[PDB]
Design a protein around this ligand. Structure first.
Ligand SMILES: Nc1ncnc2c1ncn2[C@H]1C[C@H](O)[C@@H](COP(=O)(O)O)O1
Length: 248
């Protein structure tokens, strides 16, 4: 199931509609604490969703996402496809963007450590917000090795991370005509998705208590140790759970 988002005429609410549509497009059979639990394994024909993004200038790219972990596999710009250099993306290439004439394998996987090294910048210093997503679309449509890694981190955060956390969706969407640097709280949520997903599943079989705590960074940049499902991040923020059998 594919979804789209257009930057021209975009508003905070239209970005919210987009991210809600993206979450809905990801298959799920179960929910834990009313949070959809992503599937651990899906056949190729059900494993990918396409996100179609158009910038202010009416240029469009299509983004392939693995619905089991919301990872970006690659994207298409006109007649060229670009895929990350990672096992799951190589597999994705057999199913999506099959008709592109030229196929580029990027020099890195989509892991943040590789992307920040390639971009020569850490996530905290890369602007986010709707105008930043516009620029990332332009940058990737007119692909250049020098600028792609940074744009890909904007893209991943504006799609994958926003879908996983209401907080991230809300902070990016409120920047309609301005941009902002993400706080340590955002970095922490991104870093902690797998561990949180894991502990929330364990909690469902352990009276709501985590087996191991998860350390997050709050609004005051303080380390907070999360131990159960009544914590605010579980009750009102995390929006998708990575399946325990799909963590590595
Ligand atoms: N392809 C793709 N899309 C989106 N986010 C990604 C991707 N590859 C890695 N990552 C991010 C997800 C986690 O913050 C970190 C761990 O990746 P790992 O390398 O799996 O341990 O890297």
């Amino acid at each position: 199931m594919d979804v789209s988002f257009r930057l021209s005429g975009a508003t905070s609410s239209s970005y919210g509609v987009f991210i809600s549509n993206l979450r809905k497009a990801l298959p799920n059979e179960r929910k834990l604490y009313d949070i959809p639990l992503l599937r651990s394994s899906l056949p190729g024909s059900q494993r990918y969703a396409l996100i179609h993004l158009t910038n202010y200038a009416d240029e469009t790219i299509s983004v392939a996402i693995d619905v089991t972990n919301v990872y970006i596999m690659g994207y298409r710009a006109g007649d060229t496809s670009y895929f990350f250099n990672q096992a799951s993306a190589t597999e994705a290439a057999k199913y999506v963007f099959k008709d592109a004439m030229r196929k580029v394998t990027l020099p890195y996987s989509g892991n943040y450590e590789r992307l920040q090294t390639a971009a020569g910048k850490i996530r905290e210093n890369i602007p986010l917000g709707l105008p930043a997503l516009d620029s990332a679309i332009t940058t990737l449509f007119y692909y250049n090795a020098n600028s792609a890694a940074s744009a890909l981190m904007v893209l991943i955060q504006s799609t994958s991370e926003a879908a996983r956390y209401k907080f991230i969706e809300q902070q990016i969407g409120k920047r309609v005509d301005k941009t902002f640097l993400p706080s340590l709280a955002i970095i922490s949520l991104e870093n902690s998705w797998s561990a949180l997903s894991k502990q929330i599943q364990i909690a469902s079989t352990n009276n709501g208590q985590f087996e191991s705590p998860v350390v997050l960074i709050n609004a005051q940049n303080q380390r907070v140790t999360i131990t159960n499902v009544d914590a605010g991040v579980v009750t009102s923020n995390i929006a998708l759970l990575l399946n325990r059998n799909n963590m590595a």
